[PDB]
Structures are given as C-alpha cells and as structure tokens.
Structure 1
Amino acid sequence: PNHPLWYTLCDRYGLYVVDEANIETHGMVPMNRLTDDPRWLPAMSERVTRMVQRDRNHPSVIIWSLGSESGHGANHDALYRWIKSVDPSRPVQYEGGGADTTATDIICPMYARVDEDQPFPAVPKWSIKKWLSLPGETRPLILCEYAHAMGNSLGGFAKYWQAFRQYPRLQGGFVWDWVDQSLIKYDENGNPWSAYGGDFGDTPNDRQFCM
C-alpha cells in the first residue's frame, strides 16, 4: 500500500489503481513455504484486511491484489475469499503460483510473451494469446508485469499492443516499471552520481537490477 496521498491524487487526476498487500516471500524455497502455512495466516491476513479497511472508499482503486511473488498457498485462497465477501465491488488478482490460480479473477502473468510459450514445469508462462483459450479458461488477461525496461530496452513493445488491440480478452498490462531505483552518492569533489546495488558496500547484492 502507498502513501495515503497517492490515492487522493489518483482519484482527482484519473488513474486506475491496483492496490496491493505488503506481502512478498520471493526468497523462500519453495516460494509458497510461508503462504501455505497456517501459522503465517494471521500475519498475512492483517496485511490484506487492514489495506482494504484503509483504501476501500477510493474510486481510483479498481482491483485488489494479494501481494507479489509468494507462490500460491492456502492462505492466498482464504484471503482472496475474505475480500470477495467484504467488498464485492472490485475484482481480486494475484500472480503467484502460475498467474491463473483459484486466488485470482484475472489471468495476471509477469513477462509472459506474446507468441512464444515458455513451458516451465508447474508454472508455465504461456503465450498470452494461447493462455486465453486454454481448455475451460474464461478470464480476462492483464499482465501484472511486462516489458522489463532495464537499461536499453522495450524491444518488442509494439508486439504487445498489437495483441492487446486485436484480442478482446487481452486487456493490457503494467510495464515494469516507472522509475530507476538509483541512489545519489557524492565523489571526492562533492559531485553527485547515480549508484546501484553494491555501491554502499552492501553484499550480497544484485547490482544494476534495481534500475
């Protein structure tokens, strides 16, 4: 959840917002180790429920999200249903555990390609055009993350937009991402320069992946 003024400005200027719970357990092995564990359900529930209690009156918020990159656990299903029960007015989405689990109203993959399948075991990233028409599938597809804009990038961005415009159920996506996470440091002359992972003696680090 963002600084409270963010939603005020989104209401007044006009942006659709996905409001997302402060839950990410990416570094767990497997990714759902905590989110499938009932012991972690109370802590998780508060991150979801207190977000909804705070932001439910903002018109800019059109979708709730259960968080980011935490696999798919039973705790996700429980909290998905909590929101659906408490606030029928907004769909709930969540990408973890394959982007099309029982905890999401929207197929919301990250970095699924337009035409190319990536058939990873358990959590494949189907071509977005193919994903829509899989046997039994009926949901809309909106990438929670696509077009990783890291450095000299956004090659093949036009390919997404062509597909979005042609297929009714391909309803767009959220680019990753808005702003480089570089920090200002100062050299011997007091001149400012942009720094990234590792430039603060921080180790282990992931270098320029913050940009």
Structure 2
Amino acid sequence: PNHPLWYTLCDRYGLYVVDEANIETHGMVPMNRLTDDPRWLPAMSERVTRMVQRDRNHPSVIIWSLGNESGHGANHDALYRWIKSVDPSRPVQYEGGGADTTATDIICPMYARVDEDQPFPAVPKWSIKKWLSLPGETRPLILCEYAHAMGNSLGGFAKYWQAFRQYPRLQGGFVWDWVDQSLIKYDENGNPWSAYGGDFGDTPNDAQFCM
C-alpha cells in the first residue's frame, strides 16, 4: 500500500490503480511455504483487510491485489474470498503459483511472452495469446509485469501492443518498471554519483538489478 496521498492524486489526475497488499515471501522454499501455512494466515489477513478498509473509497483503485511472489497457498484463497465478500465492486488479482490460480479473477502473468512459450514445470509462462485459449479458460489477461526496462531495454515492446490491440481478452499490462532504484553517493570532491547494489558495503547484494 502506497502513501495515502498517492491515491488522492490518482483520483484527481486520472490513473487506474492496482492496490497491492504488502505480502511477498519470494525467498522461501518453496515460495508458498508460509502462505500455505494456516499459522501465518492471521498476519497475512491483516495486510489484506487493513488495506481494503483504508483505500476502499478511492475511485482510482479498480483492482485489489493479494501481494507478490509468495507462491499460491490456501491463505490466498481465503483472503481472496474475504475481499470478494466485503467488496464486490472490484476484481481481485494475484500472480503467485502460476498467474491463473483460483485466487485471481485475472490471468496476470509476469514476463509471459507474446508468441513464445516458457514451459516451466508447475508454473509455466505460456505465450499470452495461447494462455487465453487454454481448455476451459475464459478470464481476461493483463500482465502484472512485462517489458523489463533494465538498462538498454524494451526491445520487442511493439510486439506486445500489436497483440493487445488484436486480442480483445489481452487487455494490456504494467511495465516493470517506472524509476531506477539507484541511490546518490558523493565522492571525495563532494560530487554526486548514482549507486546500486553493493555500493554501501551491503553483501550479499544483487548489484544493478535494482535499476
């Protein structure tokens, strides 16, 4: 959940917002070790419920999100249902565990490609065009993350948009991401320079992957 003023500004300037619960357990093995543990249900629920109770009156928020990269656990199904129950005015989405689980109203893959499949075991990233027509699938598809803009990037961006315009159920996505997470450091002369992972003695670190 963002700083409260963010939503006010999105309401007045006009931007559709995806409000996301502060829940990410990417480092766990497997990713859903905690989200599938009922003992962590309480802590997770507060991150979802208190978010809804705070931002539900904001018109800019059109979609609720259960969090990010925490695999798919039973706690997600429970909290998914809680929101649908207390607020039927907004769809609920969640990418963990395959981007098309029972915990999301929208197929929201990250970095799924336009025409090329990436058949990862258990959590495949199908080409978005093919994902739509899998036997029994009827939901719309909006990538929660795509076109990773790291450094000299965004090659093939036009391919995504050609597909979005041709396929009704391919309704866009969110580029990853807006601003480089570089920090300012000063040399001996006092001049500023952009720093990233590891420039503060921090280790382990993942270097420039924050930009």
Q: TM-score, structure 2 length as denominator? A: 1.00
- SS of 2:18's equivalent in the other structure is strand
- Partners of 2:208 and 2:29 in 1: how far apart? 24
Post-superposition Cα deviations, 1:110-169, rounded to whole Å, max 9, x if no partner, equal 000000000000000000000000000000000000000000000000000000000000
- Partners of 2:210 and 2:124 in 1: how far apart? 25
- SS of 1:95's equivalent in the other structure is coil
Post-superposition Cα deviations, 1:20-41, rounded to whole Å, max 9, x if no partner, equal 0000000000000000000000
Aligned match of 1:108:
108
Post-superposition Cα deviations, 1:85-116, rounded to whole Å, max 9, x if no partner, equal 00000000000000000000000000000000
Aligned match of 2:74:
74
- Partners of 1:172 and 1:108 in 2: how far apart? 10
Distance apart, 1:174 and its partner CA: 0.1
- SS of 1:80's equivalent in the other structure is helix
Distance apart, 1:72 and its partner CA: 0.1
**Which runs of 4 or more aligned residues in structure 1 lie more than 4 Å from their structure 2 counterparts after TM superposition?**
none
- Partners of 1:181 and 1:124 in 2: how far apart? 29
Distance apart, 1:192 and its partner CA: 0.2
Distance apart, 1:203 and its partner CA: 0.1
What is the RMSD computed on CA atoms of the aligned residues? 0.1
- Partners of 1:144 and 1:80 in 2: how far apart? 17
- SS of 1:57's equivalent in the other structure is coil
Q: TM-score, structure 1 length as denominator? A: 1.00
- Partners of 2:147 and 2:16 in 1: how far apart? 19
Post-superposition Cα deviations, 1:45-69, rounded to whole Å, max 9, x if no partner, equal 0000000000000000000000000
- Partners of 2:117 and 2:14 in 1: how far apart? 35
User: How many aligned residue pairs are there?
Assistant: 211
Distance apart, 1:191 and its partner CA: 0.1
1:90 aligns with 2:117: no
- Partners of 2:182 and 2:121 in 1: how far apart? 34
- Partners of 2:208 and 2:98 in 1: how far apart? 27
Q: Percent identity?
A: 99
- Partners of 1:111 and 1:19 in 2: how far apart? 20
Distance apart, 1:186 and its partner CA: 0.2
Which consecutive unaligned segments of at least 5 residues does structure 2 have? none
- SS of 2:68's equivalent in the other structure is coil
Distance apart, 1:71 and its partner CA: 0.2
Aligned match of 1:184:
184
- Partners of 1:188 and 1:2 in 2: how far apart? 36
